[PDB]
Design a protein around this ligand. Sequence first.
Ligand SMILES: CCOC(=O)c1c(O)c2cc(Oc3ccc(N(CC)CC)cc3)cnc2n(O)c1=O
Ligand SMILES: [Mn+2]
Ligand SMILES: [Mn+2]
Length: 131
Amino acid sequence: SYQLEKEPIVGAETFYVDGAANRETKLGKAGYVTNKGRQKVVPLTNTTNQKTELQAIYLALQDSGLEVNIVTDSQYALGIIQAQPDKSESELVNQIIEQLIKKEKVYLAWVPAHKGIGGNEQVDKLVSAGI
Ligand SMILES: CCOC(=O)c1c(O)c2cc(Oc3ccc(N(CC)CC)cc3)cnc2n(O)c1=O
Ligand SMILES: [Mn+2]
Ligand SMILES: [Mn+2]
């Protein structure tokens, strides 16, 4: 019930997402930074990096118009969303799936972590602080 655009969507806002989890305390943050100065950071308790990365995307999907460009450094989350499942065993993923269906156009790009990608580093620096 959804598909990913092969190209960045002209006119749409670019959401740089990221997550961070502390392995001992299970504490993590998830959020985004956009090319338009929009930001969000949420707190999460009892969690993993994977989950925080998915949560960041959920945030980006929730706080965006009918058209989005999303760039993530999560191969894990890219995997799930590119697989285009109809239903998952994960509550968080099911929430993401239905968000994507609500959208006119969705573009999801992958970028490597800590390689100087401005938007990625910006959002990393925010979610990493205190973890
Ligand atoms: C600020 C420093 O952060 C980093 O250097 C950093 C990562 O080490 C990192 C690792 C990732 O992939 C993995 C995530 C978790 C695991 N594990 C669970 C299966 C084991 C820990 C393995 C690979 C995915 N994203 C990451 N991001 O965004 C980072 O900023
Ligand atoms: Mn990451
Ligand atoms: Mn990071």
